[PDB]
Design an enzyme around this catalytic site. Structure first.
Site, PDB file in Angstrom:
ATOM      1  N   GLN A  19      -0.414 -20.875  31.809  1.00 13.60           N
ATOM      2  CA  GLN A  19      -2.018 -20.543  31.414  1.00 13.60           C
ATOM      3  C   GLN A  19      -2.203 -18.838  31.504  1.00 13.60           C
ATOM      4  O   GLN A  19      -3.157 -18.433  31.037  1.00 13.60           O
ATOM      5  CB  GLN A  19      -2.910 -21.328  32.277  1.00 13.60           C
ATOM      6  CG  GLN A  19      -2.949 -21.049  33.586  1.00 13.60           C
ATOM      7  CD  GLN A  19      -3.560 -22.051  34.810  1.00 13.60           C
ATOM      8  OE1 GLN A  19      -3.326 -23.021  34.783  1.00 13.60           O
ATOM      9  NE2 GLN A  19      -4.795 -21.466  35.204  1.00 13.60           N
ATOM     10  N   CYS A  25      -6.645 -24.354  33.248  1.00 11.37           N
ATOM     11  CA  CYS A  25      -5.826 -25.367  33.860  1.00 11.37           C
ATOM     12  C   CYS A  25      -6.499 -26.624  33.343  1.00 11.37           C
ATOM     13  O   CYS A  25      -5.542 -27.603  32.916  1.00 11.37           O
ATOM     14  CB  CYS A  25      -6.050 -25.379  35.468  1.00 11.37           C
ATOM     15  SG  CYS A  25      -7.776 -25.610  35.985  1.00 11.37           S
ATOM     16  N   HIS A 161      -8.681 -27.385  40.509  1.00 11.99           N
ATOM     17  CA  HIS A 161      -7.551 -27.192  39.610  1.00 11.99           C
ATOM     18  C   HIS A 161      -7.290 -28.631  39.037  1.00 11.99           C
ATOM     19  O   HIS A 161      -7.728 -29.802  39.498  1.00 11.99           O
ATOM     20  CB  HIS A 161      -6.294 -26.908  40.446  1.00 11.99           C
ATOM     21  CG  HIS A 161      -5.162 -26.503  39.700  1.00 11.99           C
ATOM     22  ND1 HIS A 161      -5.056 -26.094  38.470  1.00 11.99           N
ATOM     23  CD2 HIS A 161      -4.005 -26.152  40.095  1.00 11.99           C
ATOM     24  CE1 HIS A 161      -4.045 -25.651  37.947  1.00 11.99           C
ATOM     25  NE2 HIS A 161      -3.118 -25.802  38.982  1.00 11.99           N
TER      26      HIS A 161
END
Ligand SMILES: CCC[C@@H](/C=C/S(=O)(=O)c1ccccc1)NC(=O)[C@H](Cc1ccccc1)NC(=O)N1CCC(N2CCOCC2)CC1
Ligand SMILES: CCC[C@@H](/C=C/S(=O)(=O)c1ccccc1)NC(=O)[C@H](Cc1ccccc1)NC(=O)N1CCC(N2CCOCC2)CC1
Lengths: 214, 214
Positions: A19, A25, A161
């Site tokens: 990323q 994410c 995340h």
């Protein structure tokens, strides 16, 4: 459910992506899950576009964060998902370049999965990689091994995340989840994060989901 | 009541399921309704067990048919409904595998709703998906669009199927009911049946009911 299972050798998982310095994410968690679902339900593994989510999904905010729930909806509403090659990753938002005729994968729905890790392992082994949101406490200084952070330090109250459950098993009788991250292959175990399984570690079991492809 | 409303984008509806070659429509109609009631009143959407009803509901007859009223009574008497994960669908009757500690959802009662379609629309927008019995003639050949079979072809007095009202609205000034079916997603519009609203079409408004959670 089988004692162990991993989708990498079965062709339902694309290589580890990166990323970069963009907080996207969530987009990688979603494409990874969709890539697995399309392979298992349509027969072909394709590397899908995270960039489409960064540009054509305004419910989410690209590098500033997003939620898989909103992503699934955006893909359905847009009318499909293009491939990495037809809509390459830029690492930053830009005007939407989605083309209905370029889309090769379609989503018709999405489901929230059980919070029971035994049931999650069974679903994974039977239906494919699962999108999960986790507390990234035990990842920055991570190198290898089965991570099991001091419980209170990786609580579900600070999930920040989004990643992908690809497999599970045991290493020296210690249960683990094989988690595909999106920070490149030079991170962790070839781009993967191994997390303790069966303890609600880092809230990994609290927000498991999957798209339902056509 | 709102001009239009649909529970799918609001998280009160599970994925479209598939009965398989089993006349278990009644069980899916009921679990669908209970899933919506528990989500709205308890906050979490759980996919519930139709198998429990096939195996533990003795007033009804598993793959040979059933009545929503019988099913609600069984759920109440049994002490609740287990999830699909804990009591998976097999498409045929088995011995009852119900276990009190596995029950994750429970109901306190059930209600029969008005036949007035305007009232049904208002109730749906405010209280959730509605279980309805229907004459499935129009669904037998259904492809897509707003179904509206001739009266003699879909008599409101020849009920043979049980489904779920999930929404309503209009498509080109034509009022419709968005109905969740249980014949898989390749059927109809991604598993859904759209029926004319306001004409008592196929008796869709004659046997409306809902579980009571709280
Ligand atoms: C800056 C966003 C980074 C990004 C990816 C993590 S990351 O970039 O690899 C990383 C991890 C650890 C340290 C630093 C960077 N995080 C996300 O997209 C996370 C993923 C997530 C979190 C929780 C549940 C489900 C999914 N989501 C987000 O950050 N979002 C922004 C806030 C938003 N909230 C909605 C409710 O009201 C308050 C704001 C939700 C989506
Ligand atoms: C073989 C049973 C199939 C099953 C689900 C339908 S199905 O599999 O999708 C399908 C669709 C179209 C054609 C054939 C089969 N149907 C049912 O369970 C239906 C659903 C239903 C029917 C009538 C009122 C309320 C609910 N139930 C039944 O078939 N039952 C048998 C008759 C009984 N009597 C009906 C008249 O009044 C007294 C009791 C009610 C329960």
């Amino acid at each position: 459910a089988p004692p162990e299972w991993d989708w990498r050798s079965k062709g339902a998982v694309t290589k580890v992506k990166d990323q970069g310095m963009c907080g996207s994410c969530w987009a990688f968690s979603v494409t990874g899950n969709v890539e697995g679902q399309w392979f298992l339900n349509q027969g072909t593994l394709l590397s899908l576009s995270e960039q489409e989510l960064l540009d054509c999904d305004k419910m989410d905010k690209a590098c500033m964060g997003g939620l898989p729930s909103n992503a699934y909806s955006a893909i359905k509403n847009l009318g499909g998902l293009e491939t990495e090659d037809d809509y390459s990753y830029q690492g930053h938002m830009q005007s939407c370049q989605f083309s209905a005729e370029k889309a090769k994968v379609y989503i018709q729905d999405s489901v929230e999965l059980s919070q029971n890790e035994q049931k999650l392992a069974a679903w994974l082994a039977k239906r494919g990689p699962i999108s999960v949101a986790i507390n990234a406490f035990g990842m920055q200084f991570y190198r290898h091994g089965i991570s099991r952070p001091l419980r209170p330090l990786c609580s579900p109250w600070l999930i920040d995340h989004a990643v992908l459950l690809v497999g599970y098993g045991q290493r020296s009788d210690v249960p683990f989840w094989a988690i595909k991250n999106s920070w490149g292959t030079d991170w962790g175990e070839k781009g993967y994060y191994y997390l303790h399984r069966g303890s609600g570690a880092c809230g990994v079991n609290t927000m498991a989901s999957s798209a339902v492809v056509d």
